[PDB]
Design a protein around this nucleic acid. Structure first.
Ligand code: MG
Length: 586
RNA sequence: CCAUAC
């Protein structure tokens, strides 16, 4: 099961890949988790002159998230002393004066905000991006980085890659299984819509859609949404891989607890709003907002569930009357009339109202023959009233700044929202300890399931990081170390492009692409045979036997077949080979 | 006649 890594030879083919994709920047490399981790695995162990910069930096980040004001008051001293003051009068500094004056200025007044050293954070990165970044690029700990990313892009998934346990869902097309990823051992809720059932109801729209919606919501580290991680399809199954949630739903917990207290409920409201916020940023409307659509985890913090009835409005406002009938806004319910975030803000009010009550807001029967009961603080009233205005520009989260308007409410007069985002606040409730034969898969219709699958770089790197990564670095470090002394390039000096591994009429060979020729050799030899660029004509990729491979046509006449180990390899091979002969022929 | 990790 364990994810074995590729060889260090990969570097050439991969670096050629990544450079064209401009991912050889401090920015993207640092912004990636595994790139960061390998950066600190690098400098803290290896290069000496950069060690402190990261130590300082790391300590800044550790600092930022101290809960109480006094824990920062203590720590602020620690850092200035050790990292700033100790290396100040010892000269170890290419920093500025003002940096410290602004720092010391705030330091002086006994005031310790979290975004304090942010100036230093910024000016730090400049010193790293320059010389140090170059030295990093050329390393075992970069050679390592490419090997991982190679995996990233060669992660394609099957039913074997998951060890399915239980079933906890049935509806529409798919069910909600629970599972463990074999690769690592990570816990995922698997939602498997069935293509046949998707075809009968003509709900292909909604299945494809859901992926998109999943795929846009899930980037950006958000805790209050059930986020996808991978998509993959079988011959007859559409799979979404989603964050597992154990503490039932709010409809069930609303039953056991009965009605909720205000201060209790306030917790959930907030959680949700931040989730909601993330969607309105990416122009999504949930429309469906409801206790049942809000799940919990073993701790007691919530997420939003079935994106399904969600829609992108960035480029075209929808006019459909979609949603759970109990929380559909005035705007939604109309022929040929459109809506946006509003709906979510409306549903929320109804939802919150229902948490503290259970009673029903809106239903159509009124005329002859929202008004609220007398169990509310005016602060609570103020909120709901504003959220549940019958009119569009009248309500909250609308005329202005969206989720910010909501946040400002005096019901949250005593509530920090950055702390909520970390989930430092105490959970109010901890959980308890728990047909279609006559259809045919038309391969004509399968063609709109091309690029259904998507691995999410953020979530995979995280997943990997937070389990194997470190132990699997020692694995290949061992393997690599135990094979170097077993043995003991032809590249540098002359003008080379690339080098890597492939096969022919199957025999594994190490190749070396020049501007004019292409050499190869067995792993105890010199350049066996060759192939000039002046004599290649047609370079296509005939991906036969369900395996991406390359077709080369020669001026001689005979065709020539090359299979690659990973896709990233083939793609970067294809490209640089075409580039070689087309100019070489001129 | 829809929903369904309700
Ligand atoms: Mg659904």
């Amino acid at each position: 099961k364990k994810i074995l890594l590729p060889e260090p030879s990969i570097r050439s083919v991969m670096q050629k890949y990544l450079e064209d994709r401009g991912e050889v920047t401090f920015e993207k490399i640092f912004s990636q988790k595994l790139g960061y981790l390998l950066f600190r695995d690098f400098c803290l162990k290896h290069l000496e002159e950069a060690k402190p910069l990261v130590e300082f930096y790391e300590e800044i980040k550790k600092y930022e998230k101290l809960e109480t004001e006094e824990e920062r008051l203590v720590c602020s001293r620690e850092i200035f002393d050790t990292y700033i003051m100790k290396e100040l009068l010892a000269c170890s500094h290419p920093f500025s004066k003002s940096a410290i004056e602004h720092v010391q200025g705030h330091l002086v007044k006994k005031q310790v905000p979290p975004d304090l050293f942010q100036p230093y954070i910024e000016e730090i990165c400049q010193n790293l991006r320059g010389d140090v970044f170059q030295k990093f690029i050329e390393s075992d700990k970069f050679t390592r980085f490419c090997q991982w990313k190679n995996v990233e892009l060669n992660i394609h998934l099957t039913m074997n890659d998951f060890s399915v346990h239980r079933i906890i869902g049935r509806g529409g097309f798919g069910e909600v299984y629970g599972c463990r990823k074999a690769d690592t051992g990570k816990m995922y809720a698997m939602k498997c819509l069935d293509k046949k059932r998707i075809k009968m109801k003509q709900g292909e729209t909604l299945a494809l859609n859901e992926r998109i919606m999943l795929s846009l919501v899930s980037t950006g580290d958000c805790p209050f949404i059930v986020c996808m991680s991978y998509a993959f399809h079988t011959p007859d199954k559409l799979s979404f891989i989603l964050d597992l949630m154990n503490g039932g739903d709010l409809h069930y917990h609303l039953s056991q607890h009965g009605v909720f207290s205000e201060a209790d409920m306030r917790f959930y409201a907030a959680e949700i709003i931040l989730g909601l916020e993330h969607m309105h940023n990416r122009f999504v409307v949930y429309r469906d907002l409801k206790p049942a659509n809000i799940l919990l985890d073993e701790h007691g913090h919530v997420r939003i569930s079935d994106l399904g009835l969600a829609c992108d409005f960035s480029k075209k406002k929808p006019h459909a009357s979609v949603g759970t009938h109990g929380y559909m806004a005035p705007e939604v319910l109309q022929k040929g009339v459109a809506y946006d975030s509003s709906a979510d803000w409306f549903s929320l009010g109804c939802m919150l109202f229902k948490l503290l009550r259970g009673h029903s807001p809106f239903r159509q029967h009124k005329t002859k023959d929202v008004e609220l009961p007398d169990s509310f603080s005016p602060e609570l009233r103020s909120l709901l009233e504003g959220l549940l205005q019958r009119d569009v520009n009248r309500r909250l989260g609308c005329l202005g700044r969206g989720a910010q308007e909501v946040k400002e409410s005096p019901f949250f007069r005593s509530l920090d929202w950055q702390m909520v985002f970390l989930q430092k606040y105490p959970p109010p409730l901890i959980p308890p300890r728990g047909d279609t034969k006559g259809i045919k898969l038309l391969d004509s219709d399968q063609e709109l399931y091309r690029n259904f699958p998507l691995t999410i770089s953020e979530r995979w790197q995280q997943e990997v990081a937070e389990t194997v990564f470190d132990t699997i670095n020692a694995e290949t470090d061992r393997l690599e170390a135990r094979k170097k002394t077993k043995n003991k390039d032809y590249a540098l000096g002359k003008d080379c492009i690339m080098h890597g591994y492939m096969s022919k009429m199957w025999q594994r060979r190490y190749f070396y692409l020049f501007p004019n020729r292409l050499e190869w050799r067995g792993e105890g030899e010199a350049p066996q045979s060759l192939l000039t660029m002046e004599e290649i004509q047609s370079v296509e990729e005939t991906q036969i036997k369900e395996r991406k491979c390359l077709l080369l046509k020669i001026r001689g006449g005979k065709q020539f077949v090359l299979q690659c180990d990973s896709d990233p390899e083939l793609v970067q091979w294809k490209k640089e080979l075409r580039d070689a002969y087309r100019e070489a022929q001129q």
